[PDB]
A paper describes a structure:
RNA ligases of the [name]-type play an essential role in tRNA splicing, the unfolded protein response and RNA repair. [name] is the catalytic subunit of the pentameric human tRNA ligase complex. RNA ligation by the tRNA ligase complex requires GTP-dependent activation of [name]. This active site guanylylation reaction relies on the activation factor Archease.
To discern between the different conformations and oligomeric states, we crystallized human Archease (isoform 1; UniProtAC A8K0B5) and determined the X-ray structure at 1.84 Å resolution. The electrostatic surface potential of Archease is predominantly negative with a slightly positive region around the N-terminal helix. Residues 22–47 including helix 1 and β-strand 1 are located at positions equivalent to the swapped elements in the dimeric structure of human Archease. Helix 1 and the following loop possess high B-factors suggesting increased flexibility in this conserved region. No metal ion was bound in our Archease structure, unlike a previous structure of the PhArchease dimer, which harbors a calcium ion. Formation of the [name]-Archease complex, as presented here, is only possible with the monomeric form of Archease due to the sterical clash with a strand-swapped dimer. While our results do not exclude a functional role of dimerization in vivo, they support the monomeric form of Archease as the functionally active state.
Author numbering: 22 to 179
Write the structure that this text describes.
Amino acid sequence: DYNLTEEQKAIKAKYPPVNRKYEYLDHTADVQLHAWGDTLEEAFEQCAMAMFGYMTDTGTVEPLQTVEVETQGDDLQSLLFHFLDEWLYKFSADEFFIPREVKVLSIDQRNFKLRSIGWGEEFSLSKHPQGTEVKAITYSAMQVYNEENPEVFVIIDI
């Protein structure tokens, strides 16, 4: 939860809220993200939105521009890692993109390939509430469950 300007509240009211299927467990130097959904694809996209949700109130981001992230791994855990790593790099460099919403179109469970898409705009300290900088994705405790109730767990450094 953040404190919003009047302008930020107005943008949040103009766009549909994103359903939140994630939660945080805070520690001194890192945070565990837990995300879930009806599909593994939904658990992945919720994990990405949980990550960006730690940096700002993504409800205040306008869905002006579209950005695609495609990636591969050697298993589902490393696929998740590189998926989050690539989205974090879209934010931290180049176009400094912050997604309001992320969608995972497909995960190839055989080859560990993924296609995803996000809608958003350039991050800006004046338009977007300041949250906490995500310094890195860590790989020490990736967890992926891909049975009846898909869910993922990841630790990010702050």
